[PDB]
Amino acid sequence: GPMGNGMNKILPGLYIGNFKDARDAEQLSKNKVTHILSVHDSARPMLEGVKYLCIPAADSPSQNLTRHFKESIKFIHECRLRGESCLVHSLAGVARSVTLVIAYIMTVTDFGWEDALHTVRAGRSCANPNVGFQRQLQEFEKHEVHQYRQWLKEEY
């Protein structure tokens, strides 16, 4: 459905879900989630046992997410390098969270944004960033993802 059917594994240690999944103790335990990147209107730390990165942002083409790619990638990558699991969630798990995960996949592979979206959709079929987020991902691919790949190599 339009908000998914529970949080979904995208890659080892990387999940996308909706706001309800992000408070679901059974899902968080089953998936060993210890880091939550919360990107939605009212994002703030809630639960115990979880390291948070909170990005207040709207699901609108007027919302800039590119300025949050670097911090999001650092947060996800350092969690995954330690063998831990990160949930990226928005309200629906469809746009804001998906866009940050696409940027991550693009930085840890050779993929452009469309192949990264295909990867996300294989795990979470409802993924569908708005056209504004799509244009931000396209600019990222043509002008900056190569810088981020080099930063990732130099840092880790």
Residue numbers in the entry: -1 to 154
Task: Give sentences copied directly from the paper behind this entry.
DUSP22 is a small phosphatase containing 184 residues, and the sequence contains a catalytic domain as well as an N-terminal myristoylation site. This enzyme is broadly expressed in different tissues and plays important roles in the regulation of signaling pathways, such as inactivating the T cell receptor (TCR) signaling pathway, activating the JNK signaling pathway, and regulating the phosphorylation of focal adhesion kinase (FAK). The phosphatase domain of DUSP22 consists of five twisted β-sheets and six α-helices, and the structural scaffold is similar to that of DUSP3 (VHR), while DUSP22 does not contain an N-terminal α-helix surrounded by the N-loop. In this region, the catalytic activity is facilitated by C88 in the P-loop and D57 in the D-loop, and the hydrogen bonding network is formed by D57 in the D-loop, S93 in the P-loop, and N128 in the N-loop.
The S93 mutants were combined with a second mutation, C88S, to produce proteins for growing better crystals, which improved the resolution (<1.6 Å) and helped to determine the structures. In the crystal structure of C88S/S93A, the overall structure was similar to that of C88S, and the side chains of D57 and N128 also formed a hydrogen bond. A water-mediated hydrogen bonding network was formed among the side chains of D57 and N128, as well as the backbone amide of N128. The position of this water molecule was above the original position of S93 and it did not form a hydrogen bond with the P-loop. A93 in the structure was independent of the water-mediated hydrogen bonding network, and the comparison of B-factor between C88S and C88S/S93A showed that the positional disorder increased on the three loops. The S93A mutation probably resulted in the unstable active site structure and decreased the catalytic efficiency. In the crystal structure, the S93A mutant shows that the P-loop is independent from the interaction of the hydrogen bonding network and the B-factor is increase in the three loops, suggesting that the conformation of the D-loop, P-loop, and N-loop cannot be stabilized. Consistently, the decrease in kcat is observed in the S93A mutant because D57 cannot form a stable interaction with S93.
